[PDB]
Ligand binder design. Structure first.
Ligand code: HEM
Ligand code: HEM
Ligand SMILES: Cc1cc(N)nc(CCc2cc(F)cc(CC[C@H]3CCCN3C)c2)c1
Ligand SMILES: Cc1cc(N)nc(CCc2cc(F)cc(CC[C@H]3CCCN3C)c2)c1
Ligand SMILES: C[C@H](O)[C@H](O)[C@H]1CNc2nc(N)[nH]c(=O)c2N1
Ligand SMILES: C[C@H](O)[C@H](O)[C@H]1CNc2nc(N)[nH]c(=O)c2N1
Ligand SMILES: [Zn+2]
Lengths: 411, 407
């Protein structure tokens, strides 16, 4: 069976056969769509089929399907599973797996870059201090003095679920959030809960509005530990506006490296619960969501005030006007400091090219429209007009529960 | 299987039980989500009638009444005899209001119960269709104090006698291809503007030429009709800060009136059911004016704003796009013509969802369409999880007539 998607702006039509290789479920049924839902201990029983599917994929990609190197590897994995209950990926297989996990990430608009991912193998790591060291090196390498490079660092896979490696931060670099007694929030309200854990674990909070949070790191299922990322490794950009000189006086800054650190990487049935990865920012992530979400820094009010806008009725679109200025300021500040960033027009056009190429050479490109369309100026980006098929391929990145809700505390 | 939907801006969580009433299919499976795809006999008819009549008599708190069972047998007898049946006026009104209520792609559904239903089932000719449509347009326009309305023409019988309005909307601007390459007027209507001239229309070949009506009664050849200009309320578009904005020569019409959809009630198919309400600002300013496949005025506007159009990263498209939409709102509000901005309409819809979950158990909703085409995440619907499913009565798409008509 074949399926067609249409771009209603260009009339370009594409044919997807790749969804046939989809095994995992979506959440939808014939009678309900969960397309807008944000989020909809493994034994030898099912592990070898999952290994086999992965290795078939792997040897296909290197034009060695059915070779003696292919059959021997299947056999070697088999006996390793039956005798040890799990197995170890070769270096080649791990790198392939991490790239294809990103390649299969249907919510990611930056996937044109998927093949250029620097993979750091941290499977020999045994302690939280060792994790801090691996993460510091990732940050230095990925940041590259503002000329950002995509990277992922992969800590040991799960075994019995009781010895997990976990980065408790949702991102490697994030600002603290402090609930005040009067109800207000200082800093990033998205991080108030994590900030409290850190303070409880002994972090001395400066209690400012842009305090980089400490790393909280869990090795081999032991209690997590606190480390401060050396400040010289944390690249930050002060936000100013190319025309509004009062904008710098808002005191805004943001960090340069987006580095997601709380997701699970799944390859051949193996689960890598600590696998921080980073790339570079699309400007709307900072300018639209980080600053202007009602539940984040929410500077829309103060920006519109200083622009002296008609703030009485919403039909003056003062909110939309303030948002564009903020996003201009973010792009201007980053470009001025030579810190890599991509605007939402560039990124979406690139994704369309990526997606067309994926259909031609791969037979499809799983895409989550709800997430690919930028959170401002949606229909003037070409993805808005682009029909997309969403399905889940493996290797994959998955969500996992916050560790502080599952962890058994040693004391 | 009694589902929950979270709002991530407010942590508000609603439990959806209404989805279990869903009958039709979405297009998705467990293996694939098609949530962004634009478009996926006597025996079948009686269960459809029963399902509709059951929910009708429950809404009037007469489920299991003599009235209920009597109407049930009554329609059952008319089907076995005539192979169809006719709705009572009260059922027709209920059917129409609920097809709107169930329209998961519609952000304006909070007004669903205040709909004016015009019964045009006694109509027999295109001239009569025209009369009904003129009366609709005048009623709905109301000198700019717009009112919701639907006019319902005779139901399909054998598919050879279909009533059809060939226009996609009652009021739409013409679209002419140019010898030199591009398109003058509205590119979305170039083929329809063709079929009008190609059926007899005399085009003034301007940029904002109101299209004539092309009406089809009882599966006959359609006929051209010019809506009286005094019935077509239009708004000249100017900006409250930029005086040069008037010189662009832009205007739009006040009445959005969809005319090509099919209204399904109790298994009966009403293939001509023009319905109208009032515009959300972004429909005109984001889509109509700025879509690359439409009026595409963005470059001309930013040029007039003297913005740096050299790199995309200056956000000149975004900045223009806002000014254009501020103007559309300003123009309509200044001429006292009903319009709603995308912030008010989306906050209304959150309120309407809250009511539907409260007094009905749910509210089918299509996030891909509910979220406005600009400033999505500063609107409350962006952070609202929505469950999409098909309830009936419903509005459905239908093939364009000229592909089908046995001419
Ligand atoms: C190189 C530049 C990149 C850009 C511009 C980019 C951009 C984005 C954006 C805007 C999202 C939407 C999520 C949100 O808005 O919060 C996203 C999601 C995602 N990105 Fe990318 N990304 C990049 C690199 C990467 C890399 C290197 C990886 C992994 C190796 C990755 C994996 C993902 C995944 C798994 C998601 C889905 C998150 C979810 O399922 O909730 N991205 N990306
Ligand atoms: C009264 C104010 C109304 C507003 C503000 C409004 C707004 C909208 C918007 C913005 C859309 C998205 C589609 C697009 O962007 O082209 C839509 C779709 C829709 N509207 Fe409403 N509308 C209103 C009245 C009505 C009425 C009176 C009806 C029927 C009686 C109706 C039925 C529908 C349907 C069926 C769709 C979706 C068609 C589809 O399935 O693709 N609307 N509406
Ligand atoms: C590599 C990279 C590049 C870039 N440019 N941006 C990002 C951040 C986007 C992102 C990627 C991801 F895999 C998971 C989340 C979780 C955040 C969600 C959960 C709850 C609140 N957020 C909606 C975010 C990452
Ligand atoms: C009553 C009303 C009020 C309002 N405020 N707006 C509207 C227009 C929105 C609309 C409603 C609808 F039922 C069908 C379409 C078809 C347009 C699609 C077909 C193919 C390409 N277009 C996406 C539009 C109508
Ligand atoms: C490809 C995609 O489904 C298509 O562009 C849809 C997306 N969402 C939309 N939303 C609205 N309100 N109107 C539209 O025409 C569309 N078009
Ligand atoms: C409810 C809804 O799914 C949720 O708000 C989603 C919508 N689309 C998104 N798209 C992106 N890129 N990032 C997000 O966080 C979200 N949030
Ligand atoms: Zn779906």
């Amino acid at each position: 069976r074949f399926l067609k998607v249409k771009n209603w702006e260009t009339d370009v039509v594409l044919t997807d056969t790749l969804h046939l290789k989809s095994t995992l479920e979506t959440g939808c049924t014939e009678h309900i769509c969960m397309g807008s839902i944000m989020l909809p201990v493994r034994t030898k029983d099912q592990l070898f089929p999952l290994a086999k599917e992965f290795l078939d994929q792997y040897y296909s990609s290197i034009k060695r399907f059915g070779s003696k190197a292919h059959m021997d590897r299947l056999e070697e994995v088999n006996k390793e599973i039956e005798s040890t209950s799990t197995y170890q990926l070769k270096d080649t297989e791990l790198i392939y797996g991490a790239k294809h996990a990103w390649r299969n990430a249907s919510r990611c608009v930056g996937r044109i870059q998927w093949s250029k991912l620097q993979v750091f193998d941290a499977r020999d790591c045994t302690t939280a201090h060792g994790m801090f060291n691996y993460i510091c090196n990732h940050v230095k390498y990925a940041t590259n003095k503002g000329n950002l490079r995509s990277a992922i660092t992969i800590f040991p896979q799960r075994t019995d679920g009781k010895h997990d490696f976990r980065v408790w931060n949702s991102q490697l670099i994030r600002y603290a959030g402090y609930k005040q007694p009067d109800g207000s929030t200082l800093g990033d309200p998205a991080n108030v809960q994590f900030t409290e854990i850190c303070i409880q674990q002994g972090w001395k909070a400066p209690r400012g509005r842009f305090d980089v949070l400490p790393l909280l790191l869990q090795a081999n299922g032991n209690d997590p530990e606190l480390f401060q990322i050396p400040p010289e490794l944390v690249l930050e950009v002060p936000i100013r506006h190319p025309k509004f000189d009062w904008f710098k006086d808002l005191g805004l800054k943001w960090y340069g490296l987006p580095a997601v650190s709380n997701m699970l990487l799944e390859i051949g049935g193996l689960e890598f619960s600590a696998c921080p990865f980073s790339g570079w920012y699309m400007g709307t992530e900072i300018g639209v969501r980080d600053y202007c979400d009602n539940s984040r820094y929410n500077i829309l009010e103060e920006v519109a005030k200083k622009m002296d806008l008609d703030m009485r009725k919403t039909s003056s679109l003062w909110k939309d006007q303030a948002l564009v200025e903020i996003n201009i300021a973010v792009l201007y500040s980053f470009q001025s400091d030579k810190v890599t960033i991509v605007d939402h027009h560039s990124a979406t056009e690139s994704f369309i090219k990526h997606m067309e190429n994926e259909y031609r050479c791969r037979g499809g490109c799983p895409a989550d429209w709800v997430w690919i369309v930028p959170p401002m100026s949606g229909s003037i980006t070409p993805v808005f007009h682009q029909e997309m098929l969403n399905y889940r391929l493996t290797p994959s990145f998955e969500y996992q529960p916050d560790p502080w809700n599952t962890h058994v505390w040693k004391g």
